[PDB]
Design an enzyme around this catalytic site. Structure first.
Site, mmCIF file in Angstrom:
data_model
loop_
_atom_site.group_PDB
_atom_site.id
_atom_site.type_symbol
_atom_site.label_atom_id
_atom_site.label_comp_id
_atom_site.label_asym_id
_atom_site.label_seq_id
_atom_site.Cartn_x
_atom_site.Cartn_y
_atom_site.Cartn_z
ATOM 1 N N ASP A 33 0.914 -1.116 0.000
ATOM 2 C CA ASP A 33 0.000 0.000 0.000
ATOM 3 C C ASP A 33 0.957 1.169 0.000
ATOM 4 O O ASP A 33 1.651 1.408 0.980
ATOM 5 C CB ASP A 33 -0.856 0.009 1.266
ATOM 6 C CG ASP A 33 -1.568 1.329 1.483
ATOM 7 O OD1 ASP A 33 -1.603 2.146 0.554
ATOM 8 O OD2 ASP A 33 -2.090 1.556 2.586
ATOM 9 N N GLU B 36 -7.004 1.043 -4.250
ATOM 10 C CA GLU B 36 -7.018 0.995 -2.782
ATOM 11 C C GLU B 36 -8.364 0.444 -2.258
ATOM 12 O O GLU B 36 -8.313 -0.590 -1.586
ATOM 13 C CB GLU B 36 -6.701 2.361 -2.160
ATOM 14 C CG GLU B 36 -5.210 2.646 -2.098
ATOM 15 C CD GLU B 36 -4.842 4.116 -2.127
ATOM 16 O OE1 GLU B 36 -5.608 4.947 -1.588
ATOM 17 O OE2 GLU B 36 -3.762 4.432 -2.673
ATOM 18 N N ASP C 110 -12.464 5.553 3.807
ATOM 19 C CA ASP C 110 -11.027 5.671 4.027
ATOM 20 C C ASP C 110 -10.633 7.058 4.533
ATOM 21 O O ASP C 110 -10.678 8.032 3.798
ATOM 22 C CB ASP C 110 -10.324 5.383 2.700
ATOM 23 C CG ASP C 110 -8.820 5.301 2.820
ATOM 24 O OD1 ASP C 110 -8.266 5.490 3.914
ATOM 25 O OD2 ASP C 110 -8.184 5.042 1.787
ATOM 26 N N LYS D 191 3.019 11.420 -3.637
ATOM 27 C CA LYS D 191 1.783 10.843 -4.176
ATOM 28 C C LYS D 191 0.821 11.939 -4.662
ATOM 29 O O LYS D 191 0.012 11.684 -5.559
ATOM 30 C CB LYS D 191 1.120 9.966 -3.118
ATOM 31 C CG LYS D 191 0.102 8.988 -3.668
ATOM 32 C CD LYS D 191 -0.455 8.192 -2.556
ATOM 33 C CE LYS D 191 -1.504 7.245 -3.024
ATOM 34 N NZ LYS D 191 -1.952 6.374 -1.915
#
Ligand SMILES: OC[C@H]1C[C@@H](Nc2ncnc3cccc(OCc4ccccc4)c23)[C@H](O)[C@@H]1O
Ligand SMILES: [Cl-]
Length: 387
Positions: free
Chosen positions: A8, A173, A197, A69
């Site tokens: 991840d 994800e 999330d 990211k």
């Protein structure tokens, strides 16, 4: 034999798992942590990755890189890129309209592409996994957010290749989270899953329809700038205020005192997810004055009440975009450490009229868990195709 890892590659933290002997194993770093900060620090003598890098961030803010990211696969002209830059202590330069991170390394000016930085966080993950297993590991499944575009996906794969990993698949994800809970194995029919999330700096709501084990992304909603760190800030401002009330001294301008207090608020917050009270224990916070105090779950929930409420709006939007009622969602999956907050779980639970939430697997590790499951499945499939 042919082993494969699930990684991840998170905005703030990365987690690495391996499916072995009918069970997923989330691998602890040498420091013993089950997640690793997505931090890369360049110093006067070395390249620091993970915890070591995060620890020295106050000391070396300019050449300690995080949030790659946010920039991966993006153009330099991207509005998100332009906005994000104003808040980073490290320099971001424009090369061929491709963003690069310019730092000081061993007394020299060196620039890196976001995938180069990520490749370094993936090398740390590749190494962590190899330290655990005792042999080199290159086959990997790397996860990305569902909203990620093709350019973003390729850049993440490029980072994996640079890191020396054979990227089996780039999977979403939320898909990985569903896989972790084996929601793609409930048999025939449509299964509507909602992924909640909540990370340290991002919030993502994903609705998926799993029909005969096949995944379809119906809706994606959220806040790119909302997460755990905002709750931390709320605690910091409460305590800066408390210090003024108690000692008549403003500690806000002291960079070290506020950073030490932030660190303590992030730990107090965590304690609060499992207990009603949390106590700060800071030695010589400001001007030799120790800051030994306490806060309650109730007061924390009050300092963050509006923020917790905001999470629901993204959920409502997702339901509309996916064209579904609250009652039409079969499963609710929690992802991200911030989902451990009882008020957050209660708010989500109340919204879905008491529906139980999938929270057995660690929220921090659900994605890496699902990615490790997929990696094993693919590696087996690739090998079985061979002999
Ligand atoms: O970047 C990861 C997020 C998740 C936050 N973790 C937690 N937030 C609230 N309650 C928690 C209770 C127990 C454990 C938690 O997280 C542990 C952790 C720390 C660092 C990375 C991953 C998980 C919690 C953490 O403080 C940060 O904001
Ligand atoms: Cl381990």
């Amino acid at each position: 034999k042919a082993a494969a890892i699930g990684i991840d590659l998170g905005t703030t933290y990365s987690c690495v798992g391996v499916f072995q002997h009918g069970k997923v194993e989330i691998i602890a770093n040498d420091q013993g942590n089950r997640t690793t900060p997505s931090y890369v620090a360049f110093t006067d003598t070395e390249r620091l990755i993970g915890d070591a890098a995060k620890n020295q961030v106050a000391l070396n803010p300019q050449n300690t890189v995080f949030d790659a990211k946010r920039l991966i696969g993006r153009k330099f002209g991207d509005p998100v890129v332009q906005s994000d830059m104003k808040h980073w202590p490290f320099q971001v330069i424009n090369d061929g309209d491709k963003p690069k991170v310019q730092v000081s390394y061993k007394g020299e000016t060196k620039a890196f592409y976001p995938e180069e930085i990520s490749s370094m966080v993936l090398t740390k993950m590749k190494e962590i996994a190899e330290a655990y297993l005792g042999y080199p590991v290159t086959n990997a499944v790397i996860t990305v957010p569902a909203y990620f575009n093709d350019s973003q996906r390729q850049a993440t794969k490029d980072a994996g290749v640079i890191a020396g990993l054979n990227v089996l698949r780039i999977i979403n994800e939320p898909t990985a989270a569903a896989i972790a809970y084996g929601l793609d194995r409930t048999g025939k029919g449509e299964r509507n899953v909602l992924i909640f999330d909540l990370g340290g700096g991002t919030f993502d709501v994903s609705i998926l329809t799993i029909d005969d084990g096949i995944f379809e992304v119906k809706a994606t909603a959220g806040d790119t700038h909302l997460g755990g760190e905002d709750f931390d800030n709320r605690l910091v401002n409460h305590f800066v205020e408390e210090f003024k009330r108690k000692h008549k001294k403003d500690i806000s301008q002291n960079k070290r005192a506020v950073r030490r207090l932030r660190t303590a608020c992030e730990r107090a917050k965590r304690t609060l997810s499992s207990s009603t009270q949390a106590s700060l224990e800071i030695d010589s916070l400001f001007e030799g004055i120790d800051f030994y105090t306490s806060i309650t779950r109730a007061r924390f929930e009050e300092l963050c009440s509006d923020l917790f409420r905001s999470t629901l709006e993204p959920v409502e939007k997702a339901l509309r975009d996916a064209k579904l009622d609250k009652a039409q969602i079969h499963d609710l999956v929690l992802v991200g450490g911030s989902t451990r907050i009882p008020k957050v779980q209660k708010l989500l639970q109340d919204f879905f009229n008491g529906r139980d939430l999938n929270k057995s697997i660690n929220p921090d590790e659900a994605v890496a868990y699902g990615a490790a499951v997929q990696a094993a499945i693919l590696i087996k499939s690739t090998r079985a195709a061979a002999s």
